[PDB]
Amino acid sequence: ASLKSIIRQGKQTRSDLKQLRKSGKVPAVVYGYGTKNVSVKVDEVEFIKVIREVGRNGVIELGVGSKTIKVMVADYQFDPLKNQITHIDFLAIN
Amino acid sequence: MLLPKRVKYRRQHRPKTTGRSKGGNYVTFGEFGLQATTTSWITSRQIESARIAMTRYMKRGGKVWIKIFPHTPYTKKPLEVRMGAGKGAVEGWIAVVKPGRILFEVAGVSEEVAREALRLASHKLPVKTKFVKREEL
Amino acid sequence: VSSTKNGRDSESKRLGAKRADGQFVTGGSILYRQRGTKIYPGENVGRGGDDTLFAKIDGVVKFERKGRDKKQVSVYAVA
Amino acid sequence: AKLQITLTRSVIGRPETQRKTVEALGLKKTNSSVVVEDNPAIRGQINKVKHLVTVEEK
RNA sequence: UUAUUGGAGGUAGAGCACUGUUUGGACGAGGGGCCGGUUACCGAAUUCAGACAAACUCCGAAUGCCAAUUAAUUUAACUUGGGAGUCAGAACAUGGGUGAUAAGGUCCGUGUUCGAAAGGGAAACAGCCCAGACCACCAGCUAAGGUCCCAAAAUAUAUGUUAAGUGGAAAAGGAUGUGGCGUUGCCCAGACAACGUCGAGUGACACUGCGCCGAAAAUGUACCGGGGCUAAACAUAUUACCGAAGCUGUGGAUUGUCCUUUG
RNA sequence: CUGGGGCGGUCGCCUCCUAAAAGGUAACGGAGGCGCUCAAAGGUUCCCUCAGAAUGGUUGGAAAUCAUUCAUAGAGUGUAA
RNA sequence: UCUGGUGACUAUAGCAAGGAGGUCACACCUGUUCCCAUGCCGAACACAGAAGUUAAGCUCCUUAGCGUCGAUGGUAGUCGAACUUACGUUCCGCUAGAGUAGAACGUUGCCAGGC
Ligand SMILES: [Mg+2]
Ligand SMILES: [Mg+2]
Ligand SMILES: [Mg+2]
Ligand SMILES: [Mg+2]
Ligand SMILES: [Mg+2]
Ligand SMILES: [Mg+2]
Ligand SMILES: [Mg+2]
Ligand SMILES: [Mg+2]
Ligand SMILES: [Mg+2]
Ligand SMILES: [Mg+2]
Ligand SMILES: [Mg+2]
Ligand SMILES: [Mg+2]
Ligand SMILES: [Mg+2]
Ligand SMILES: [Mg+2]
Ligand SMILES: [Mg+2]
Ligand SMILES: [Mg+2]
Ligand SMILES: [Mg+2]
Ligand SMILES: [Mg+2]
Ligand SMILES: [Mg+2]
Ligand SMILES: [Mg+2]
Ligand SMILES: [Mg+2]
Ligand SMILES: [Mg+2]
Ligand SMILES: [Mg+2]
Ligand SMILES: [Mg+2]
Ligand SMILES: [Mg+2]
Ligand SMILES: [Mg+2]
Ligand SMILES: [Mg+2]
Ligand SMILES: [Mg+2]
Ligand SMILES: [Mg+2]
Ligand SMILES: [Mg+2]
Numbered sequence: 001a002s003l004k005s006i007i008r009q010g011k012q013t014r015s016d017l018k019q020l021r022k023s024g025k026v027p028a029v030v031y032g033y034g035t036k037n038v039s040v041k042v043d044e045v046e047f048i049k050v051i052r053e054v055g056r057n058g059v060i061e062l063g064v065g066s067k068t069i070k071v072m073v074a075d076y077q078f079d080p081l082k083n084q085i086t087h088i089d090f091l092a093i094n
Numbered sequence: 095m096l097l098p099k100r101v102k103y104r105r106q107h108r109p110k111t112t113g114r115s116k117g118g119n120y121v122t123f124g125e126f127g128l129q130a131t132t133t134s135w136i137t138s139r140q141i142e143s144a145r146i147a148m149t150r151y152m153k154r155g156g157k158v159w160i161k162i163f164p165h166t167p168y169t170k171k172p173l174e175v176r177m178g179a180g181k182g183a184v185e186g187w188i189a190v191v192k193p194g195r196i197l198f199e200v201a202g203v204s205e206e207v208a209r210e211a212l213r214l215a216s217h218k219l220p221v222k223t224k225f226v227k228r229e230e231l
Numbered sequence: 232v233s234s235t236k237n238g239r240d241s242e243s244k245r246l247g248a249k250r251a252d253g254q255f256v257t258g259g260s261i262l263y264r265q266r267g268t269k270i271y272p273g274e275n276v277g278r279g280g281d282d283t284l285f286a287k288i289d290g291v292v293k294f295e296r297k298g299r300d301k302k303q304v305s306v307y308a309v310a
Numbered sequence: 311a312k313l314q315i316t317l318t319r320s321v322i323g324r325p326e327t328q329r330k331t332v333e334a335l336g337l338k339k340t341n342s343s344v345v346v347e348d349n350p351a352i353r354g355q356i357n358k359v360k361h362l363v364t365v366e367e368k
Numbered sequence: 369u370u371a372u373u374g375g376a377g378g379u380a381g382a383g384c385a386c387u388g389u390u391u392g393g394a395c396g397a398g399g400g401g402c403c404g405g406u407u408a409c410c411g412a413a414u415u416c417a418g419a420c421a422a423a424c425u426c427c428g429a430a431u432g433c434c435a436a437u438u439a440a441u442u443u444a445a446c447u448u449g450g451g452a453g454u455c456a457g458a459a460c461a462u463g464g465g466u467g468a469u470a471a472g473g474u475c476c477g478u479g480u481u482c483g484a485a486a487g488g489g490a491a492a493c494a495g496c497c498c499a500g501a502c503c504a505c506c507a508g509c510u511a512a513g514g515u516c517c518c519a520a521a522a523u524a525u526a527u528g529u530u531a532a533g534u535g536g537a538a539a540a541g542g543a544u545g546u547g548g549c550g551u552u553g554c555c556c557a558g559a560c561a562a563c564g565u566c567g568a569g570u571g572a573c574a575c576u577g578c579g580c581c582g583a584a585a586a587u588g589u590a591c592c593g594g595g596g597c598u599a600a601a602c603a604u605a606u607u608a609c610c611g612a613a614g615c616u617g618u619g620g621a622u623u624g625u626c627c628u629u630u631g
Numbered sequence: 632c633u634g635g636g637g638c639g640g641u642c643g644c645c646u647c648c649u650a651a652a653a654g655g656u657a658a659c660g661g662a663g664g665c666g667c668u669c670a671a672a673g674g675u676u677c678c679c680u681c682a683g684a685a686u687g688g689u690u691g692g693a694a695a696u697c698a699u700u701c702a703u704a705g706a707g708u709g710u711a712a
Numbered sequence: 713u714c715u716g717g718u719g720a721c722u723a724u725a726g727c728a729a730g731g732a733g734g735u736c737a738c739a740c741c742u743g744u745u746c747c748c749a750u751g752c753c754g755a756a757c758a759c760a761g762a763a764g765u766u767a768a769g770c771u772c773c774u775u776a777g778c779g780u781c782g783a784u785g786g787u788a789g790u791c792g793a794a795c796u797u798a799c800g801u802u803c804c805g806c807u808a809g810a811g812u813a814g815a816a817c818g819u820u821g822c823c824a825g826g827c
Contacts, residue, residue, distance in 0.1 A: 015803065017786090024550095029785045031813055037784045045550080051231055074812060077786065078229070080119050080129070081194055082575075087786045089812070098389055105661065107422055107649080111469060112799045114788085116382080118419050123392065133799045135469085163390055165420050170468075177467065177474070177634055179659050180235035189420085192799085220540090234640045237661055241645050247653060251434040252375035263376090270376095294375055299722045302376095319511085320499055320614075325479060327369090334369040334442050340499085341510090341615050351371040351440045357805090358370075361793060379652045381789050382809045386705080413684105423648040423662080429808055430790045433653050463651055465660065469799090474634075476657050477650085678757100 003050050003062045006041040026085055030064065030071065032092035038064055044085060059093070070094065096138050096164055097187045105181050106166060115194030121228050123159045124201035126208040128215065131222040135188040138164040144215040148198065151211045156202020164189040191221060250292055255310050258289040262304055271297055273305035312368040313352070316343045319362045331359045 008027070012020075017027065024044045031037050042062075050060060051073075060071045069092050077087040111133055121127040141162060148158055164187035171182035191197065198215060200208050209225055216223040246264045250256055263270055263284040272278045273295070275287040286292070290306045297303045317337040321329055335355055336344045345368060346352055356365060 013804075027786065031784070033813095037813095039785060048231065048551095056231070080226075080229070081131075084575095089785075091813075096390095100389085102388060102421095103423070103662080107465075107661095108469065109421095116419090116788095120418095122418065157392090159392065161391080161419075163420080165389065175233075179233045179634095179640095181466075181660070217541090222540090232639050233659090235659055235661090236640090237663090238641070238659075239645090239663085241647090243655075245654060248376050248434075251436090253373090254435055292375095296722070322500065323480060323498085327479095331369055336442060339615085346441070349371085349440055351369095354370045355441080356370095358792085377652055377654105379650100380808105422650105427809065429652095429788105430806065431652100432791100465649065466658080474658085475660095477655105 001050065001054055001059065001061050003042065003046060003060055005062055005064050007065060008039045008041055021084075021086065026088055028088045028090055030069065030090040030092060032090075033094045035069065035092050040064060040090075042088065047085070047088070060090075062090070095142055098165065101167065104167060104184060105169060108168065109166060109188075109190045111190065111192075113192055115192045118161060119194040119196055121196055121199050121226065124157070124199035125228055126201070126205070126212065127196045127199040127226050128212045128223050129194060129196050129226050130191045131193050131224055133190075133192050134219075134221045135190055136162060136164070136219065136221075138187045138189070140219055144198070144218045147214045147218060148200070148211055151214055152200070152203055152207065155207075156200060158201075159199040161196050161199065162189050162191065166190070196226075197223070252294050253291060255291055256286050256289060256306065258286060261285050262292060269302070270294075271301060271303040273297075273303035275306040275308075276304050312345055312347050314343055314345050314366045314368045315356070316341065316364045316366075317362065318364050321362070324362075328359050328362070331355050332362065335359075335363075337363070 005028070012027075020027065020041070025041050026044050026047065028040045028042050029037060030040060051058075054060065057072065060073070061068050062071055063069075071090045072093050074089040074091040076085055076089065078084075079086050119129065141160065141164075145158070145160065152158075166188050167184045168186060168188055169182045170185040197219070198212065200211060203211075212223075212225055246266070248263050249261050256262070261283055262276065265282050265284070268278075268282055270284065272284055275290070277285050277287055279285060284304055286306045288306060288308065290308045290310055293305050293307065295303060295305065315335060315337065317332065317340050320340050321332055335346075356363065
């Protein structure tokens with residue numbers, strides 16, 4: 001429940017999104033209680049291992065910059081061909 | 095032998111073929127399934143041959159679903175005719191698949207039986223296929 | 232021997248809008264040409280016998296919504 | 311400030327929508343230049359035809 | 369022509385709220401097994417989930433269209449009159465009908481070129497890529513494409529793949545062919561083979577790059593243009609050069625616009 | 632006219648689709664209608680608001696008709712869309 | 713501010729549910745003598761009334777249950793460009809529908825009365 005994130009900068013183009021997915025990274029956003037919209041980056045391999053040990057519906061304490069937020073998972077877009085996760089939405093709860 | 099009982103227009107334009115699957119690309123009714131990898135038409139004789147070869151291998155065990163129905167009629171003009179004196183009579187009924195679409199779903203059987211039953215069906219369709227599970231996570 | 236029984240069509244009628252939003256018009260000019268009432272008349276706009284919308288006075292023309300999903304035309308005075 | 315624009319690719323084989331923009335800039339033959347000042351309406355015409363011209367900051 | 373504003377309209381895509389089509393599962397009412405009813409079966413209704421549409425739409429782009437601004441850059445536009453020729457069109461790319469998701473087919477829309485256009489490249493080759501010839505010159509810079517010899521310019525630098533002359537004409541399928549990247553099994557307690565020995569690695573799955581078989585036609589090698597090539601192939605980066613009637617340089621001709629010394 | 636010509640079929644007008652979100656746009660491309668009617672089915676002034684479904688109720692052809700609750704027009708609108 | 717009359721605004725304004733409110737306004741309510749009225753019915757409409765009542769309409773609170781509104785981020789599609797003939801790829805602009813967080817149990821002009 002200790003996953004790490006990296007804040008994306010402004011205005012990702014088309015190229016640097018697919019260049020980000022040819023690494024092991026996946027784009028993401030966080031929103032909800034007490035926060036603002038922050039768009040982030042998560043490793044794919046690390047994200048699967050956290051889900052497979054806390055379940056589909058569990059609490060993740062991930063860190064954005066300095067602070068850490070208790071975060072649940074809202075939805076995710078999946079590519080059924082070539083079977084990789086392509087977007088993940090995060091929801092803060094408190 | 096699948097065909098609709100009544101259609102408003104018997105003579106129709108042919109469907110658009112390029113692109114990706116609009117929807118219906120996750121297994122929902124069963125445990126295992128067969129998804130497509132290239133693009134083709136399926137002409138309602140192929141899914142009769144494929145459903146029979148599906149069924150006799152499983153010895154009437156678990157259930158089998160078909161996610162494809164042939165909705166669109168296509169025509170053909172008779173033998174040795176000049177071009178253009180109207181549009182010919184109907185010939186058969188097709189359904190269009192694009193890469194992603196699930197074709198059959200099976201359930202109620204072990205996994206290695208499901209791989210072999212779907213492999214026998216896949217040699218009767220004109221499209222490259224692939225064996226898939228029920229996705230989670 | 233084969234033949235067909237479809238060759239008929241009507242002549243097309245040049246429907247649609249005839250003046251643009253923000254344009255100055257003269258006091259009798261046709262604004263919109265339609266079957267039925269896709270657009271209602273508003274201020275200083277008459278509605279003809281064959282549902283043609285036309286201007287009463289001369290001025291500038293404004294298209295504008297009416298309710299949730301209704302549209303109207305008005306003509307306002309000063310130019 | 312000022313910009314120098316140079317017609318580097320020729321204009322034949324191109325659509326007439328792009329030929330009329332090149333004339334509006336004031337370019338006549340290939341490798342011919344013009345000096346104008348920077349302006350958001352001038353950047354729009356450079357944006358349209360940017361695969362045919364070369365801009366330097368004068 | 370562009371920037372900024374405003375507006376008309378229902379395509380692409382999506383979707384099932386109407387019209388039609390359709391797959392499973394439930395719910396119960398009816399007939400309906402029976403001995404009137406059970407249960408099975410039937411059709412209809414209502415719901416849960418999931419799919420289809422040129423003549424379906426609760427939604428809805430990009431672009432194109434109409435206009436207005438003491439906006440900015442450009443140079444056309446319109447009216448009247450005199451004089452014509454044209455009404456067999458073609459290929460390419462793209463959006464669609466027809467046809468067999470056949471034709472160098474046929475019919476519409478949108479662009480380019482040919483027609484009526486030489487020059488360079490594509491071996492040769494109206495329609496493909498570059499590019500629009502006033503005339504001299506034994507002067508220079510470049511485009512597309514190229515730099516072993518034919519034939520002008522790198523047997524150039526650096527990293528890797530391929531062993532099939534692949535390159536230098538094709539599929540479903542099949543396969544211990546070889547590289548790269550991941551997940552996960554059994555590990556020196558002795559596996560994994562072969563028969564206590566053997567003493568270190570051993571399997572599966574998944575995604576991928578190049579290649580192999582599948583591959584039979586008629587005058588003579590016989591689709592690399594030829595020689596020839598294991599790079600002179602392929603992929604990725606860098607620096608140089610060749611290369612046109614394109615652009616510069618020098619001189620000259622004709623016409624026009626300015627200034628005007630009609631120079 | 633004609634994917635040679637003949638045989639066959641068609642020749643004027645209206646509405647949809649093709650038609651590529653202005654308008655326009657072809658083919659022996661796909662679907663249908665017209666060659667009228669109305670003395671009120673016209674004008675004006677006042678009133679009214681449906682089909683359908685559900686539930687009850689002699690005739691109940693199941694539904695004719697009656698009451699009740701909902702019901703965006705699904706009704707109806709002389710005649711195709 | 714409270715009540716009423718009357719206008720403006722894409723239901724964020726609606727629908728449902730729960731609770732309070734009244735002889736000042738409003739309404740149920742009393743009656744068919746008169747104007748007027750019902751394909752029959754003083755139900756409706758019209759008139760004459762003020763005994764009764766806050767039960768209902770109405771108004772004020774409470775709720776996000778249905779409907780409505782709705783970003784950010786990602787994706788589909790696409791103008792332009794560059795490779796190519798593959799049911800294509802790459803770059804750059806624009807940017808959906810669905811879904812999620814959330815909004816929301818109206819806002820406001822004029823007059824009269826009651827404060
Ligand atoms: Mg779906
Ligand atoms: Mg579509
Ligand atoms: Mg179509
Ligand atoms: Mg449509
Ligand atoms: Mg003619
Ligand atoms: Mg002609
Ligand atoms: Mg041709
Ligand atoms: Mg063709
Ligand atoms: Mg054309
Ligand atoms: Mg000629
Ligand atoms: Mg020309
Ligand atoms: Mg030439
Ligand atoms: Mg040559
Ligand atoms: Mg050739
Ligand atoms: Mg020639
Ligand atoms: Mg040089
Ligand atoms: Mg070059
Ligand atoms: Mg030679
Ligand atoms: Mg040489
Ligand atoms: Mg070969
Ligand atoms: Mg091959
Ligand atoms: Mg072979
Ligand atoms: Mg031979
Ligand atoms: Mg040879
Ligand atoms: Mg020259
Ligand atoms: Mg258009
Ligand atoms: Mg149009
Ligand atoms: Mg007829
Ligand atoms: Mg009474
Ligand atoms: Mg949206």
